[PDB]
Chains A and B, each alone.
Chain A
Amino acid sequence: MDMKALQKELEQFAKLLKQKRITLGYTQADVGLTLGVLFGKVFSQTTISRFEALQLSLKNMSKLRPLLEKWVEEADNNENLQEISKSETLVQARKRKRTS
């Protein structure tokens, strides 16, 4: 609609993206690699850095935003999966050792 509101929304999103990638333990290179794997288009560390630095074309920022949203969804899913699985293994091993 206007460049002001869009850039505001985007800059806040970029912050949020960084936040999530750190809390999930992906390097910049890692995000590039995984985006590459699940959408079949390679992304360099460089472009990810540029994204997180809001140093990309508004078009490119908004072009990547959907891709990152899907990525974040998939990343967060995998995190929850692993977390649940790990605690499951914990309970398991614990009980087992205990009785044995």
Chain B
Amino acid sequence: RVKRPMNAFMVWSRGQRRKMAQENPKMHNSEISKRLGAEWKLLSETEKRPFIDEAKRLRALHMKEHPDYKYRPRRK
């Protein structure tokens, strides 16, 4: 089953949280994720740019690969 493509945050967050867990284990991902949203908010456009371009490339490749994808949630 095809999973929905990841945004720019998700890309950067994925990068960070691996190093952060290597660095300091027995830290739960809840503290981790609060920390990373906090951090990401503080970056400039300049800083964000490669992750933005990366997520663009990912969405492009996802559509290219699965042409007939449609995001189908399960609403409450």
Contacts and interface: CB of A to CB of B under 8 A. Distances in A.
A65 B59 CA distance: 24
B20 to A, nearest CB: 28
Interface in A1-26: 18-19, 22-23, 25
Interface string B39-76: 00000000000000100100110010000000000000
B63 A25 contact: no
A19 B56 contact: no
A7 to B, nearest CB: 19
Contacts, number: 11
Contacts of A19: 63
Interface residues of A, number: 5
A18 B71 CA distance: 13
B31 to A, nearest CB: 30
A62 B2 CA distance: 32
A48 to B, nearest CB: 14
A18 B63 CA distance: 10
B2 to A, nearest CB: 15
Contacts of A23: 60, 63
Contacts of B53: 25
Counting from the closest, the 5 A-B pairs by CB-CB distance are A25-B56, A22-B63, A23-B60, A22-B59, A22-B60
Interface of B: 53, 56, 59-60, 63
11 contacts: A18-B63, A19-B63, A22-B59, A22-B60, A22-B63, A23-B60, A23-B63, A25-B53, A25-B56, A25-B59, A25-B60
